[PDB]
Amino acid sequence: MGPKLFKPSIDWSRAFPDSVYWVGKAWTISAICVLAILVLLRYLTPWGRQFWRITRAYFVGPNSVRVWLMLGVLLLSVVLAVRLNVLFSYQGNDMYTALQKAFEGIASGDGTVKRSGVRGFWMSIGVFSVMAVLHVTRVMADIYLTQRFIIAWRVWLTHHLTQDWLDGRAYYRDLFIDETIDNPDQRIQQDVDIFTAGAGGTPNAPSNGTASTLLFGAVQSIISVISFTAILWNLSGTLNIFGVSIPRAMFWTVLVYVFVATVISFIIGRPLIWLSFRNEKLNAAFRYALVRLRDAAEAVGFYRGERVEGTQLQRRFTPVIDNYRRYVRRSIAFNGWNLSVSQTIVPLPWVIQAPRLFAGQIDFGDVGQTATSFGNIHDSLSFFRNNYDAFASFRAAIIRLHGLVDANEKGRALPAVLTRPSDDESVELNDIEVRTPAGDRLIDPLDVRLDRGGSLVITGRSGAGKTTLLRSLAELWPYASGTLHRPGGENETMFLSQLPYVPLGTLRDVVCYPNSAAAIPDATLRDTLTKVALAPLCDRLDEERDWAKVLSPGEQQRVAFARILLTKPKAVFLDGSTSALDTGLEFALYQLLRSELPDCIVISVSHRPALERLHENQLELLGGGQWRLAPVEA
Amino acid sequence: MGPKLFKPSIDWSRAFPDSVYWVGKAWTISAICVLAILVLLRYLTPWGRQFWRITRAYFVGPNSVRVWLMLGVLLLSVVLAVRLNVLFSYQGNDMYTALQKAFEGIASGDGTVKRSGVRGFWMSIGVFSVMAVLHVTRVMADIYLTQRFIIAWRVWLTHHLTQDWLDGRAYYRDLFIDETIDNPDQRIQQDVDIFTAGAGGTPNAPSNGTASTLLFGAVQSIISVISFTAILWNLSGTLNIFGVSIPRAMFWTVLVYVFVATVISFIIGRPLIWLSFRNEKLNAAFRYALVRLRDAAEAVGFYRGERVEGTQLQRRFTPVIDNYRRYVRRSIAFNGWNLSVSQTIVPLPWVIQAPRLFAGQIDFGDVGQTATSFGNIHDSLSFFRNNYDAFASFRAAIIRLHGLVDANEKGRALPAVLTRPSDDESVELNDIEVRTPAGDRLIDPLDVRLDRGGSLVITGRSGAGKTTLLRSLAELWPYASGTLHRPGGENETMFLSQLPYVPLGTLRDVVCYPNSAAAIPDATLRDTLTKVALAPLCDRLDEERDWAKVLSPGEQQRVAFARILLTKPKAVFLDGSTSALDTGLEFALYQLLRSELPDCIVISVSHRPALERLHENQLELLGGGQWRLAPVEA
């Protein structure tokens, strides 16, 4: 309380050479405990145990020597933010220190403290011109850095998940597992963005800095409590209320005040998670019902069915807007509580340090410098309930993804049929039985053996087990028993489907489907198209329009016979394959196939009685188990 | 500058009875010009001319007497926010007025102004206890109101758009228009939320108040400039810089300072729109390539095609992350400019009103009350460039939707075939010619006439014009010419498709497809299923699993013959319909159809030569135009 002209808090020279040493002391002692508190979170927390299984291999191994070095700069770019906020309070003390001398020198009649109290006011603006360029050049050097880390996380994670999805035929076997999951188109396109952005339940947009990320919004709000506690601890008073006498009231009041409002802020947003998990599923079972309609547009027009289908969208839409009107009724009562507790504390330090100012105990700088600090350590400890709803939707993005990796791990543990390679050319099978998930019986244990040159046709009933035998002989059906010896290899067992399939790309990839695009010489790609009477498609081989609804269904089978000859297998199975072709061109194709390929074991399924002149054995399924194998004659 | 104890600015009694009259004066004079400035925006602005065509009928007509009454309360709940912010400055003047008397009474030796200067300090907290409950009970009474307006906008708009999509067979004819649009599954599920939320390019989440909406963030930032200009205008000084002498410098400096930084903030974010339109299309042509894979899972397994399809996702993914690394390079240089101009103005009023305080011109209240006002009218005029990027993505949500309503209006202006109702039972056609969009010729102008009891089969070549004639006779194909007389009605011309189709719902809707669910008596729904040998599906009629991949393709045709008999038409066309059934059950079905329905004009397309014993006429297409019509014998 001395009548000296002006006393600055710090010397302001040897201030920058001293504020570099504190950063170097507070970097390492933060990092070597942050790694400990993360490693302690991986083991003993059930929302974080499922985190490491999702994104394991990106952090260990040899390639992760660059990710940690990118991560280690962002801790520096947070300590450098706390160190500026300390000096923004140490500057703001001096204005309210100098403006008391500059006032009372006028009323006291002094002429040497008014002249020497205003020299401090033209000093404290001199700090606010260099501590305000470093604040602007930091934030613009922070948006660019944290926008080049999550890109290299997303572009690796959405490649790691797809290769595990379609690795082991797990894109088909997931429909037979017990606790089935739904619409995996959303867990790759959409819910990898929210999981790797870390912000909320919202995808990232190019303005998210470090201060809006759930991991780095916490370490910034823990360092900024340890650093701002050495100032208030030697500033509070001994408030003697009735009863007991508190030694330091201001520092110990906020610590019990935050704790009561923290526990109440956790038992309100408790079912807030499962109301934000259903909203991402009900708005994904709605967008499937339109994509099923769009590329089925031809068959709905012939039926005039625009009044039944109009009921289904209203039946699948109305539980979305009904599961939103009880989700907005929860996130008002929770958000109305964390506003009514962050307002009724703001005129607190102005009344506990009020009578110590009208008496000469302090000198008007400490009131403002106390208000700035109490409005900082209370807000930075208020991070752990004011950002709870933006953690809830994030925790519904970890369960949603973890239900995919642990659904194609249980997708390959179902039984199948064992295959072994033959020695030269033979298709034999010892015993094969197949069933139905209801628990029926289709085929009894049967036996057959075929050699290099041979043929076989399978006829039977209308819908009693004729494709299921083909679905079980390629390791694609779960309920079966037996073995198989095949002429194995890479592409030596070519199947075809009862319904035709085309790919998505250009016309150069529609004809060479199992092979790649450039592995076929273009000089004789067009020549084999003339052998199957597709002359007017020899041109326009480099178009780009979709071929799903352009070609006829009778034109998608003659292109498959071009797919057979461009791979040259030895164990071709094919069913249907002439559902639209007339008689007169079919056996011409078969006499072409026999004369271009001498020895391929043709195994077919047909209904019209005009193919038995081309096969030497015949298997008939009477349905229910009784089968008969016989050679044909005349 | 009087030495009186304390002078409050307003009387603080008859303050609430006077602050109600100003709200009533500032409500109507705001509304009757806001309607004018909106009506002037509808006509003469090309981003707003397309706005009224999207959402026209929700604002005119008889039902819109409730929407305007819901809208008129939110203007009151914004004027009530500006009127509190005026008094938050009129309160904050009094602290810095009283704390000068309370200081200089200590140094001057006075004992009757120190005692009577501190009584003002225990008055200005008495205002901060009632003007802080009304701030909390307003915001929590504002989140609830604006969350029940956009729900009743979304739940009407996403119903208005779908009924216009599939009204006039415009879900199929859009593939023949000139400037084709893509993936209309996204313009209904996703891009109705951003258009009706009004916030940014982000969907709404249940914490958006009035202060985060592009319409009501502007009227709140125009009233709050007219109201805060009567205070600074009688407070600035006459700053005599070298050269000319400005009469009122502080008020006229900010007005030319915002204008220079506003024009520069518009020529930086100029191509920011078309970089935020491509991001919503490239992340919607990626989510189609997985939904095409998921329900095509059977045919890919037989082909082992997991290496070509793995190239296509990487070919369709990499221009998404490449159209993001030049979008983050634009929204840093723009966002680095509107931060470097909202920082270099903040120590301005502390240095223009500095020497008027160390001399006794003003009395330390006006410095703070000037700083609070200059940090308010500068920020509220800074709304029109600090919220420009969140307008750009919104303007890419109006073009994206307007390309849908103006794409099924041009989707029904294509030519077709004219139909007229017959008198009793007759299918005649005068002349019909059909073509191909390349400009080929399929069928010459032909003629045929059929009566009550009759039949016809159409055979021909492999893929030369046999379904296109059926696609043009139901007003579904654009390139055709001619007329038709039909036995019309509601459901008296039933077609079938060459590929079978099932609906999505339960098993009660898979068999009664053009009719509704409850319009069929359940006592005889099961009895007609026994006539087509579907006995073991008579049970389990109320299941819920999807029937796309459960039934066989040979089982989806015998259920269609149950769809025919449950509607009883007179002019049934059917093609294929026996692609999987063996001989022996087919003519049993036809002799069932002839014996349950006596007179229906059966018109079929078939390839196997076993149906000509059931028809009396026959049309043969030789391909290229030459056709022949003849009766069959033996």
Ligand SMILES: Nc1ncnc2c1ncn2[C@@H]1O[C@H](COP(=O)(O)OP(=O)(O)OP(=O)(O)O)[C@@H](O)[C@H]1O
């Ligand atoms: N974009 C297109 N949309 C529809 N048809 C096309 C298109 N481009 C070409 N076409 C022609 O349409 C014909 C399809 O014929 P249609 O629709 O009658 O099937 P189809 O010949 O009856 O098949 P099938 O005879 O095997 O049952 C093809 O021959 C093809 O030349």
Ligand SMILES: Nc1ncnc2c1ncn2[C@@H]1O[C@H](COP(=O)(O)OP(=O)(O)OP(=O)(O)O)[C@@H](O)[C@H]1O
């Ligand atoms: N969820 C299911 N998945 C697969 N098959 C099922 C399922 N439920 C029942 N099935 C049985 O599978 C049989 C389908 O037979 P398959 O797959 O061999 O077709 P298909 O009988 O060859 O058809 P078609 O003989 O007309 O070509 C049906 O008879 C049905 O009883």
Ligand SMILES: [Mg+2]
């Ligand atoms: Mg089958």
Ligand SMILES: [Mg+2]
């Ligand atoms: Mg056809």
